[PDB]
Amino acid sequence: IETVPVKLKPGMDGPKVKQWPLTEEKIKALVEICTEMEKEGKISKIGPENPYNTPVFAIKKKDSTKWRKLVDFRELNKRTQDFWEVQLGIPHPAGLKKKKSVTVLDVGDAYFSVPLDEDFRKYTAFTIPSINNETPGIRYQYNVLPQGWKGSPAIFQSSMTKILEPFKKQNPDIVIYQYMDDLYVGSDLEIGQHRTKIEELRQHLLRWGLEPPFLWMGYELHPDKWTVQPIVLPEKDSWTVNDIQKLVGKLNWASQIYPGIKVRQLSKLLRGTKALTEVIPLTEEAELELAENREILKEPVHGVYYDPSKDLIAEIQKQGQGQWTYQIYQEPFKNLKTGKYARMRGAHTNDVKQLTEAVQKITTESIVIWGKTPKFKLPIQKETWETWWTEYWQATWIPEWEFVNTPPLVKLWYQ
Amino acid sequence: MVPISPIETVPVKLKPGMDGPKVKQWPLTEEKIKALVEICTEMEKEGKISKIGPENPYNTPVFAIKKKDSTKWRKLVDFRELNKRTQDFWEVQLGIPHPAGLKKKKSVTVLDVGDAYFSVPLDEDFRKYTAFTIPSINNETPGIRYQYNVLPQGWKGSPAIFQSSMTKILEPFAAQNPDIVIYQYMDDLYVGSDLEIGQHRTKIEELRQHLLRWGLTTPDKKHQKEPPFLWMGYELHPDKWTVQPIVLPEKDSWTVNDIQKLVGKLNWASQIYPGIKVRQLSKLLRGTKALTEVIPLTEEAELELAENREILKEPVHGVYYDPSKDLIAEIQKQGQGQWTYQIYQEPFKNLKTGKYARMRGAHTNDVKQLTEAVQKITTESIVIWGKTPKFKLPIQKETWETWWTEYWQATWIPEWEFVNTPPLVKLWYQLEKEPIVGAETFYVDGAANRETKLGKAGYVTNKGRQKVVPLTNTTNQKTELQAIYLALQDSGLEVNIVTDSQYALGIIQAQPDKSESELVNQIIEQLIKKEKVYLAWVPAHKGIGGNEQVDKLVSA
Ligand SMILES: Cc1cc(/C=C/C#N)cc(C)c1Nc1ccnc(Nc2ccc(C#N)cc2)n1
Numbered sequence: 001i002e003t004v005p006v007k008l009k010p011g012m013d014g015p016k017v018k019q020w021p022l023t024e025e026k027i028k029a030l031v032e033i034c035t036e037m038e039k040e041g042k043i044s045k046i047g048p049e050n051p052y053n054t055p056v057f058a059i060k061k062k063d064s065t066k067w068r069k070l071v072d073f074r075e076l077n078k079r080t081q082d083f084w085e086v087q088l089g090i091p092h093p094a095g096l097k098k099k100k101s102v103t104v105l106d107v108g109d110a111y112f113s114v115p116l117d118e119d120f121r122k123y124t125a126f127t128i129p130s131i132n133n134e135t136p137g138i139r140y141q142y143n144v145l146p147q148g149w150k151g152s153p154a155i156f157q158s159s160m161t162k163i164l165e166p167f168k169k170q171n172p173d174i175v176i177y178q179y180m181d182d183l184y185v186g187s188d189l190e191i192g193q194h195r196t197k198i199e200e201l202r203q204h205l206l207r208w209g210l211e212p213p214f215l216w217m218g219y220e221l222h223p224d225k226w227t228v229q230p231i232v233l234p235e236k237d238s239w240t241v242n243d244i245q246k247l248v249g250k251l252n253w254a255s256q257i258y259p260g261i262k263v264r265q266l267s268k269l270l271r272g273t274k275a276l277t278e279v280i281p282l283t284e285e286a287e288l289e290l291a292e293n294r295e296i297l298k299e300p301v302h303g304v305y306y307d308p309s310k311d312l313i314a315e316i317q318k319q320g321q322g323q324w325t326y327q328i329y330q331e332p333f334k335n336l337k338t339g340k341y342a343r344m345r346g347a348h349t350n351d352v353k354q355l356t357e358a359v360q361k362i363t364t365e366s367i368v369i370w371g372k373t374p375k376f377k378l379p380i381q382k383e384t385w386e387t388w389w390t391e392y393w394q395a396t397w398i399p400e401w402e403f404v405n406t407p408p409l410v411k412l413w414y415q
Numbered sequence: 416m417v418p419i420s421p422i423e424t425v426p427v428k429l430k431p432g433m434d435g436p437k438v439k440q441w442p443l444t445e446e447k448i449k450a451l452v453e454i455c456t457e458m459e460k461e462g463k464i465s466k467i468g469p470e471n472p473y474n475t476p477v478f479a480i481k482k483k484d485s486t487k488w489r490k491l492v493d494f495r496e497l498n499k500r501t502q503d504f505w506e507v508q509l510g511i512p513h514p515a516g517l518k519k520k521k522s523v524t525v526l527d528v529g530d531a532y533f534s535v536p537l538d539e540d541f542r543k544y545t546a547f548t549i550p551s552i553n554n555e556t557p558g559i560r561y562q563y564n565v566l567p568q569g570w571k572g573s574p575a576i577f578q579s580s581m582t583k584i585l586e587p588f589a590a591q592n593p594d595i596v597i598y599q600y601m602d603d604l605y606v607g608s609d610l611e612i613g614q615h616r617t618k619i620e621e622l623r624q625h626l627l628r629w630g631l632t633t634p635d636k637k638h639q640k641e642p643p644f645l646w647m648g649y650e651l652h653p654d655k656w657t658v659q660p661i662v663l664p665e666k667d668s669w670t671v672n673d674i675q676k677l678v679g680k681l682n683w684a685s686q687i688y689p690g691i692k693v694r695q696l697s698k699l700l701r702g703t704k705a706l707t708e709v710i711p712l713t714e715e716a717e718l719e720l721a722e723n724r725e726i727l728k729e730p731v732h733g734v735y736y737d738p739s740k741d742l743i744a745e746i747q748k749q750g751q752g753q754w755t756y757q758i759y760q761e762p763f764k765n766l767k768t769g770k771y772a773r774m775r776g777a778h779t780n781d782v783k784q785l786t787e788a789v790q791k792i793t794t795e796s797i798v799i800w801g802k803t804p805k806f807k808l809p810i811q812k813e814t815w816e817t818w819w820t821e822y823w824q825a826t827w828i829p830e831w832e833f834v835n836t837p838p839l840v841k842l843w844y845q846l847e848k849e850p851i852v853g854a855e856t857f858y859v860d861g862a863a864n865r866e867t868k869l870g871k872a873g874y875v876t877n878k879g880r881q882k883v884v885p886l887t888n889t890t891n892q893k894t895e896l897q898a899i900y901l902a903l904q905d906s907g908l909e910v911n912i913v914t915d916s917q918y919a920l921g922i923i924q925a926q927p928d929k930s931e932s933e934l935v936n937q938i939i940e941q942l943i944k945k946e947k948v949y950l951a952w953v954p955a956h957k958g959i960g961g962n963e964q965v966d967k968l969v970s971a
């Protein structure tokens with residue numbers, strides 16, 4: 001109820017980010033939401049002496065009918081002081097990724113109970129545009145901790161720890177981790193048990209609150225069942241010239257990740273200038289080399305470590321037929337996680353919706369495993385992504401991304 | 416007296432660390448000084464400025480300009496220095512409405528609010544920074560010192576604060592009268608509606624009564640401006656719109672600057688005149704910016720100019736937006752990277768038109784360009800109408816399906832239907848997913864020496880067919896492409912090709928149908944003639960048969 005002092009980083013002005021174009025349905029929804037928020041004292045109209053801006057849009061969280069306001073604070077988040085007064089966003093819990101069930105709660109509504117430092121409010125300015133700019137955009141700033149701002153969980157942390165003290169000492173094996181507007185709650189219980197403990201948790205925030213529009217929701221994860229992608233080589237009885245060339249190509253690539261991979265004996269099978277479809281019998285020497293390579297590929301990659309000071313990088317490849325592969329790393333050839341998807345939701349004829357869902361799922365995995373979001377290298381033209389991703393977005397955070405314009409030859413090797 | 420509501424002041428600051436201006440007042444002639452004193456005495460009587468003591472240390476220069484063909488002098492306070500020191504403001508005029516998003520109106524009335532402008536007070540704590548000095552006659556007494564109490568003309572914050580103040584005043588009227596639209600441009604309010612003239616004029620009277628609550632008077636003798644409005648380069652009429660007249664000059668010889676003005680006119684025209692083209696005329700501006708240099712018009716630029724004159728022969732108008740009807744966007748390929756489009760709701764009545772040009776790049780293809788044009792029109796349509804139009808595109812549904820399912824990137828175009836209007840966008844070649852049984856296998860390679868620029872390109876095949884060609888003035892990259900070209904030239908209609916060139920694979924996997932490289936263009940032409948092509952990559956220098964033999968032949 002008393003404001004925590006907040007500053008930007010030294011020699012750093014507030015965000016001045018352009019509002020991107022919004023559809024009629026999203027403008028109508030934001031007008032309605034913001035009219036309510038203004039009545040409830042959460043935001044106030046501002047004047048022209050405030051030149052700052054952060055983009056806003058609206059989303060429908062997974063399995064809902066109601067619009068949620070989403071402010072894109074990525075720039076304000078970069079420019080905001082780091083929060084190390086005492087608690088450092090909690091050392092990441094390494095056991096959250098080992099629980100049988102992790103439920104994700106939207107708890108962002110709790111932040112609106114804490115006022116925002118009067119001198120920092122101007123930097124939260126945003127604009128509801130009008131269609132065709134026919135009427136002046138509606139300008140607001142926040143009076144309370146906003147959803148999506150890095151400072152909100154930091155400032156609210158003290159109050160959140162106190163809300164869940166009763167639930168924590170009652171359920172000491174439960175891992176509870178907060179990231180931005182999400183609360184991640186991991187248990188090893190049976191799911192019907194789990195959902196009841198989750199509902200138990202909701203009541204603590206319902207009772208403290210006295211209504212949160214999306215607190216009732218639950219995104220259920222099962223990180224103990226998360227699958228990885230080791231390198232595997234074909235097992236064949238008939239190898240064509242083409243098959244062996246593909247094998248030597250994949251092994252050459254793997255030898256950058258794994259030291260002792262050899263291709264000398266396999267290449268020797270191709271001596272001459274043969275038709276691509278001709279079948280070549282494996283010699284014993286080439287078969288030995290191949291088995292030795294298979295054995296190397298069963299071991300972990302050497303010298304792989306996570307450094308919390310370095311960015312995580314996520315790469316994604318489109319494999320076709322709705323399948324997507326991805327790798328998360330900090331240094332080239334030192335993958336920290338690899339994976340593959342196919343069950344991409346109601347998007348069998350929409351590549352870009354599938355990629356947007358993939359991006360969300362990888363970011364969620366990143367949050368659960370390291371407590372931060374990765375920087376994506378997306379296989380899509382910037383203009384196509386920027387026109388469409390907000391139509392499919394269902395998360396309350398937004399990662400960073402860049403665009404891949406040249407086809408990677410390595411897509412073949414992750415297939 | 417009738418009490419009036421005050422207009423709330425906007426708090427204003429100088430930029431961090433900066434102080435107000437302290438600019439020397441220029442010397443003035445005795446005649447200019449007497450004119451300024453008269454002018455400022457009137458302004459002071461009106462409350463716009465106030466005399467200040469000598470403690471204020473700030474100053475901005477003031478000038479006297481002869482209003483041409485009149486014995487009347489006009490005052491100019493030059494606020495350039497204070498503007499550099501004044502904070503940035505939120506600017507609303509950044510986005511201007513496009514006429515094609517407006518709605519038809521039966522009546523549009525104009526109201527002058529020039530007098531309202533200076534009922535807008537300046538933040539009391541900022542006034543000191545607006546100080547200026549009229550010099551005295553013969554400089555024998557202190558100059559007269561004044562500061563502003565209202566928003567000064569030419570000060571950085573005046574447009575934003577005036578707009579914000581009027582918007583706040585108009586907000587309740589607009590909300591409680593949803594059957595009118597109101598727009599502020601300069602010192603005028605435009606009020607439009609679909610009411611019968613009686614009710615419409617009643618709304619105007621009520622607006623004047625609303626404005627009086629703040630003491631803002633509007634002239635009784637109604638405005639001289641009446642439809643059509645000349646606004647931001649457009650002509651707005653009650654039920655249609657167009658661009659102001661576009662007249663391409665006749666010229667025997669053309670300058671850099673003349674071509675820049677011609678392209679600007681054409682670009683402006685292209686939003687309602689269908690089919691305008693500017694590629695060949697913009698090609699003449701490549702690189703150079705010597706505004707007076709003359710450039711010969713190529714025959715292709717003259718053809719383009721001629722075509723544009725024909726398009727601009729007679730007026731064309733757009734219609735306004737009917738929110739009850741779908742928006743449709745149709746696109747045509749024009750050639751040389753150019754695309755043109757029309758957005759309409761009823762057949763043959765365009766809301767607007769426009770064009771798209773191929774981005775600068777080494778390689779491209781029509782499907783990619785069509786896709787970019789669709790995204791551009793989509794985003795423009797969200798701005799203007801708040802929704803995506805349904806598209807009519809010159810590409811078969813089966814062509815698109817093949818393209819996007821096989822393309823290495825994610826790609827999407829929103830709801831659309833095929834329109835069978837040539838030229839159609841098609842896939843000129845598709846590579847095989849698997850090696851071709853019975854097709855000859857060419858192992859290609861090239862190499863070059865970086866010092867001599869001499870190289871070799873060639874192939875060897877499983878049938879013993881072989882070729883090596885010596886090359887001059889070349890590079891490793893060029894020789895690798897040359898080798899693939901030779902294999903395409905010398906093979907039958909089905910061919911397997913094995914290369915170690917990651918560079919060539921990167922190009923071919925991008926599926927270009929046109930390139931800045933004439934060698935890539937030659938490869939594309941050969942690919943179009945084949946029935947089946949499978950392109951296989953192997954790593955270099957790994958003892959792979961075929962590849963090893965040809966690498967030795969070409970690196971010799
Ligand atoms: C942007 C705008 C500029 C002008 C005027 C600017 C100036 N000068 C006048 C008005 C009233 C508006 N605002 C809107 C809003 C929605 N529909 C319309 N339709 C509309 C406007 C003018 C005419 C006419 N004639 C017809 C329809 N105008």
Ligand SMILES: N#Cc1c(N)cccc1F
Nearest residue numbers: 582585586589597598599
């Ligand atoms: N003009 C105008 C206007 C409007 N149409 C709506 C709201 C506030 C405003 F200032």
Ligand SMILES: [Mg+2]
Nearest residue numbers: 860862955966
């Ligand atoms: Mg070589």
